[PDB]
């Protein structure tokens, strides 16, 4: 049984941070030997487990979600980080396990005539839970009274990153894959 | 429900919004900047006018809410700056000739030309046919027309226009609470805050001449040696201890002295610094001049430029048939693309100013993490400021001699400082006073106290008894001068650019002491002093988060503006011109005028 782990991550369509997709490839055996090629990867990073050893380690249950945050909004997908990303999207656990994935694809996501593609919840009336996932585009009012744009005080939540070729470092779109290793056995209770 | 949550939402529909319709007009605009073309042309107005719609759609809503409910003074900052409406306020019969107004000024400025009165065929523009002219002439008579040609045509012909654009926008500042059009204009300055970190419109008025009263001293002795000068230029032509006419000024209104440094050069003998030929002899074309800037910002601790600013900028002119405009800018077009357009040649002073923009860029890459309404200078003169700084500490020859243009020997010539520090003051002395009598003319204009007859007659009367400057030929009441000057004309404020060079040596002289610099203020180099960069990037990151007497005092140490760190840069010149005018005559009659005889 073996699977390759990065070729379905090198699909020309990645979900963007509303609608990240959560690409279960579990129950096979892989070659992290990518994970060590940080000349492509942008930002190589691990949270509660050993990134060098995370080949050795066998206790992985992996729940990759996929989605494409800018360059400055990277650094935002941290636990215990929050931000305009970090708390409308999908947020990472404060004692979440696992590591983070980033790589500068300004060149593939990005167009120079503005790619805007992609969404992400700019407003939202409370606070998304880690691991949920909210679909819905009703239009927000700060009140919280239903109504209908252009009504003064009714804006839509969803907006699109300005994506382009020609933006500076930290405003180039980076695609984002959360590997949430895990052990799948725990004897919780009898 | 309440306010202050129904305007950071709205604020945040504002600012996602925002950055998208300015980038696209920051693309657009830069696209036509560097590529000239009808195609670009339309591409630019179709994004432009996206942003201006949408932000003046916004900008109404903003008035909905109510300024004073709010309680948190960082989103007030931005609820204000939203709520400014200028010509909306006004009902839509009077906008659209206020808009004319402006449009036609603009136009009879822009479009406008004078004639030479010897060679009717000719009638050159001021950019650069009359440009030429005031900057590069020495004598009397081809000064005299082309100086007034420029305000016989231009400015009468803005003389009516100018007095609905005084009535109309007193009307749209008196639609708000703002007493007149200069009650408005002094509102940049105007803060609400906590006590003792306040400002007022009011004490505007009274700072300036606070300032302009010290200088006076420093200025007039500067007057004097000038004239002094100057009268060798033009002998029997003008009175020794007469105030200086308006011709001979080194440039068209008299906005700077600093043509006039061929014919006012303390010592003619020793030559100004220039490393432009052992420039080109180290082989630097285009990209070492910004590589080492680079590296003189990053000496002090300030941040290295990105790697998009090297590909997206232009940093030389096209060598294929694209026309661009070589006017150099630090283009900071948001998202983080800062850039700078640069026809830069193998010359100290394309060198130098590559670290004037980049002074820009450093300040943009600074306040870049303030909200969109916030990201800019503390006020209007703080983003100028900061640029100059940097060109003067690159051009001192203690930095020079770091980076390998000098010969590890070399004569640091007590001469060559008095030429550096004169050159320096035909430039920021020469302004101040000009700087100050147009907003005390507009001022008491937009107060009407100026008699209309006599705004013209009172330009001169102003003129002479706080700037030094008269006229070279009678002015009848007809004759706008104040109009005839882009900033006038265009609808801008000019009071930018006093506090600016005040802000520049409270910047420099507290930049030079933490950098423990001995010696006189204009030799002082911060280059590899961190200390310094991270005194001014303090300044430099808060933006206009907070009032510009908060943000003055982190870098100063002083609650307001003042010009005793400028009096300190000049104090070696000062100490000469004291010395050198014990033989001439200080301060200026305001009862002369050349063409009585
Ligand atoms: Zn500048």
Known sequence: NLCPFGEVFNATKFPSVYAWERKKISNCVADYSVLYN????????????????????????VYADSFVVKGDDVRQIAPGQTGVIADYNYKLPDDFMGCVLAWNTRNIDATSTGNYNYKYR??????????????????????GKPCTPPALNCYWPLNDYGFYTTTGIGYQPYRVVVLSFEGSLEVLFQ | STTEDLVKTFLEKFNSEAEELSYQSSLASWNYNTNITDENVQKMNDAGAKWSAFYEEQSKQAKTYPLEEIQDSTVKRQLQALQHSGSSVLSADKSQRLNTILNAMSTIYSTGKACNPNNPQECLLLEPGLDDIMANSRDYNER??????????????????????????NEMARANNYEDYGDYWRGDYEEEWTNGYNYSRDQ????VEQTFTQIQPLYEHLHAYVRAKLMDTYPSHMSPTGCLPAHLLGDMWGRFWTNLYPLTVP??????????????????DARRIFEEAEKFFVSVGLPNMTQGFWENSMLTEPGDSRKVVCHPTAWDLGKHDFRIKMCTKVTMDDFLTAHHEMGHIQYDMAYAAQPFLLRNGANEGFHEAVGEIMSLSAATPKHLKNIGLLPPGFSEDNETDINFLFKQALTIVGTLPFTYMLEKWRWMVFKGEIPKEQWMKKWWEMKRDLVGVVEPLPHDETYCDPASLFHVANDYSFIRYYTRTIYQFQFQEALCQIAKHEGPLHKCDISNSSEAGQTLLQMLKLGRSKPWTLALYRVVGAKNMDVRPLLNYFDPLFTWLKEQNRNSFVGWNTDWSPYAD
Not at chain 1, 53 to 61: A, I, R
Not at chain 1, 122 to 139: A, Q, T
């Open chain 2, 144 to 169: 005299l027309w082309a100086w007034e040609g420029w305000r016989s045509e231009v400015g009468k012909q803005l003389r009516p226009l100018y007095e609905e654009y005084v009535a109309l926008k």
């Open chain 1, 122 to 143: 700019y407003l939202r009336h409370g606070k998304l839970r880690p691991f949920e996932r909210d679909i819905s585009n009703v239009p927000f009012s700060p009140d």
């Open chain 2, 204 to 207: 505007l008025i009274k700072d």
């Open chain 1, 38 to 61: 940080s000349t492509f990867f942008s930002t190589f990073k691990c949270y509660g487990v050993s990134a060098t050893k995370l080949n050795d380690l066998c206790f992985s249950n």
């Open chain 2, 267 to 284: 010592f003619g003998q020793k030559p100004n610094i220039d490393v432009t030929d052992t420039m080109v002899n180290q082989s630097w």
